[PDB]
Design a protein around this ligand. Sequence first.
Ligand SMILES: [Zn+2]
Ligand SMILES: [Zn+2]
Ligand SMILES: [Zn+2]
Ligand SMILES: [Zn+2]
Lengths: 48, 125, 49, 252, 47, 193, 207
Amino acid sequence: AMHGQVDASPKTWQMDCTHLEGKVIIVAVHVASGYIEAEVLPAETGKE
Amino acid sequence: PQSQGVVESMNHQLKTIITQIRDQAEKIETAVQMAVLIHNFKRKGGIGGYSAGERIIDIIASDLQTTKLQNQISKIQNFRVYFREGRDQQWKGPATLIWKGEGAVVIQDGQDLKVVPRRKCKIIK
Amino acid sequence: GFLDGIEKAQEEHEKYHNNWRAMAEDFQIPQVVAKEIVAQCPKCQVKGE
Amino acid sequence: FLDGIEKAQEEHEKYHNNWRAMAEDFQIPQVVAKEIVAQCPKCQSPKTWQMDCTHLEGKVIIVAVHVASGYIEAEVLPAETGKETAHFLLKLAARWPVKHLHTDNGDNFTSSAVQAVCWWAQIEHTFGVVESMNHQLKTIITQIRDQAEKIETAVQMAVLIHNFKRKGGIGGYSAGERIIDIIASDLQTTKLQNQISKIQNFRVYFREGRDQQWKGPATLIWKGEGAVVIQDGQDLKVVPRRKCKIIKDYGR
Amino acid sequence: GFLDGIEKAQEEHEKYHNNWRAMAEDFQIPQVVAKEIVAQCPKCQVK
Amino acid sequence: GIEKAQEEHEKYHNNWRAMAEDFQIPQVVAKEIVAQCPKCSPKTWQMDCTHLEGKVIIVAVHVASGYIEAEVLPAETGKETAHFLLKLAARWPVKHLHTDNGDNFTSSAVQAVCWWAQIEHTFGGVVESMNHQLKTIITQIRDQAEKIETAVQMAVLIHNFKRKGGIGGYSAGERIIDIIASDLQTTKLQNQI
Amino acid sequence: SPKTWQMDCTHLEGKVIIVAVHVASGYIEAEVLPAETGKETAHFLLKLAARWPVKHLHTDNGDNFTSSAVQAVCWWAQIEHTFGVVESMNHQLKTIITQIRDQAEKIETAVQMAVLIHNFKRKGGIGGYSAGERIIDIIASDLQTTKLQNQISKIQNFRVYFREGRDQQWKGPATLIWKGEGAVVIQDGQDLKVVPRRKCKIIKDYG
DNA sequence: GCTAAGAAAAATCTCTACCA
DNA sequence: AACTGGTAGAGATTTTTCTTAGC
DNA sequence: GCTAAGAAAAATCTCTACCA
DNA sequence: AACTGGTAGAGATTTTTCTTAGC
Ligand SMILES: [Zn+2]
Ligand SMILES: [Zn+2]
Ligand SMILES: [Zn+2]
Ligand SMILES: [Zn+2]
């Protein structure tokens, strides 16, 4: 029953991919401020 | 999934905004980019009352300015400090004095910062 | 005054769906008017208590 | 305090400084320094972008350049129709604050899609630096072409080398530090202007020394803890708080 | 909401020149917007 | 440090000055590193001339600090330009002169002064900003003096020591003094070690 | 004193030369005057004040040094003018003028070449420095002292939102003291502490 | 004979996953 | 117009109990 | 002229769903 | 041997601000 604390350096980004309406969205977030960039991929491969 | 909790929370926020402004676009890519714009510049509240863009601008500008300021301060310093710490009363070598405060001093030794009280240190010019 | 600010905040919430703090800081209207502008929207209001 | 204000007034009368230098040197708050600057009769863009389309190796590249610092965002289009130009403009308006767009008289720049994007994003579109930035970007593209398989990888790597590696100018900064510092200065100006209007919506009745009468309504400038700075008769002065009555002013 | 109340208060003060507490008790708007409506009139004065 | 500089130039192809500043390498090794690539200054002054109220104003700008030095010329001949360049070389150390393809700067007297002062004379978005800022200051303080010469010299003084702008918050004279002092200490320590 | 200048005048070949000397390093700026009136003297003083920082001036009780134009220029440039080395510098300047006279046609070319030779081509002293290196080093040291004393408070005017052990709420805006590579020293409620780099956000917080 | 430093042992408070 | 989250366990911090040195 | 009751308005604290 | 939950909103409770009656 304890929780950790993630990194909050001023040059750290986190990335993930999600699904919506059969499309593949990819989200990248700057952590220390909450800045969102997002795109739509045609597939979930490595080149995109 | 709790390790990268920030991007999952931002997935939830982006999906709620996409469901809010879905009826103003035809495709889903335009709605994604409009949800990014609405989240970035049209939502305030947080640490300093900023939005996201003002906060990232403030963070990077403050980082650059404080690096330049502390370089220009630390390039012309003096007043080395020999201090005594540890479980045994030993003496360590040359350390750099950073700030002289009423109660304690800040020393830098081996690229490590420490706070030492004024009873266990002596300054050599 | 801020009456044109109230009308422009109504159109800006009709387009962008801001929260109340963004309108109350951009258009310099008091917070009760911005909270009422947010409260009179059906596309909003998705939260428990 | 009052000596610092009078020294700042004489210094601005002589040399016509800015408000940041006087607020840092004479140790006065920034609202009083901006008041002294705004009262001068002789002392009276960070959000403009330029767009361009070019061709390279059978592809169509579109370049958007922030003018005040030299900041390049580029992309590769599949065709040269209006919808992909409107989509790139929407992405640029989603990432950076854009309020004035400068383009040429192309066909795909004059379309209903670009007009609807500029209407939804509230951007002033004006039909008429960029050639010099295109020359520099194409020389970098021809410099590191062999390290990439496709053309888009070389385009994005050239954008990275141009933004964060080539340093020049007066102080020797890159382009990203210049655009971040310029936008941060504009943000500081807007926040201070909001505070200035919110303080200046008041009125002060002040009472002079060795007199039991209240004088005329002087405008409040800065309300401190022990001192109060007022403007009266086109002159700034400091009156203590025990000889003042601060009332709301409905004078629209 | 009271946005239509603010519009009707602007019309009613443009015709009859009411005071701020009367419009705030009749049209049920807050007192700051009613005081601002009285403040914007060049002929009236909030008292 | 040398392997880091070689990897950095193989990746991004930096110039030798930025590599010598960021990786702390003497300049001859960085010069040879840049010269060995197949794909590939604190004493540089730029000169210009302009017109204002029928007079000819010559302006010399130090580039790496933004320092100004202006003078009123009675004519646009070559002898007065050579005399101003001689005074500029006699006041500040000049090693590289940048000019435009003009008529007065391409003269036998100016070339003789350049030979006697040992200056590399080269012909070719900073100087236009400096001239525009000098014009705005001249239009600001015009009514505090009678002739245009006193207005030009007071505009030079205000632009040099009374405009604390930019990122660092430094005037022009403090910047050029600190730059030449740091370059002198760098050359001294490199000649010693 | 790093900001004190002295002035004098002399005659050569029927002309009048005026020589101003930075005293603490021996820096000579000399010009040829077509007349001995106060207007061109105040113009030369204005050019000297526009090129180099002059904070204290010392002259003699001459006829052109006592002028309303000189008083106006000193008032406009905030110069403390006092009435009372330069003779030795004038002797050195005249000897260099007679040394390289045979290469100059006019007189002003020989005067400015003698100024260049005395400023940058006569390395002497103790450390083996010229005059330009001495004046640059002196002014740089004084400016470094004053800007250090201002930059300490200028770097202490920031705000830090930090995070402590086992608490998921960001604390209040403590004051920054020094930002290291992997540690940040903050002051919070007159208590100094050290937090890691991955638990802090540094804002200036305009508002 | 009496008191108190010190260490072990028991009582209490705060926080989390899983059940649908 | 009459409905609703709760249970048990792991550590951290405070409190009670027991043994023994010093005066 | 000055003080204080009283009500409105803004600032702060505690608690929950959803993202995987 | 070097890893980790966070974001935004709805009410409740405390604090500041503004108008006006009483002495
Ligand atoms: Zn809404
Ligand atoms: Zn002015
Ligand atoms: Zn009215
Ligand atoms: Zn190369």
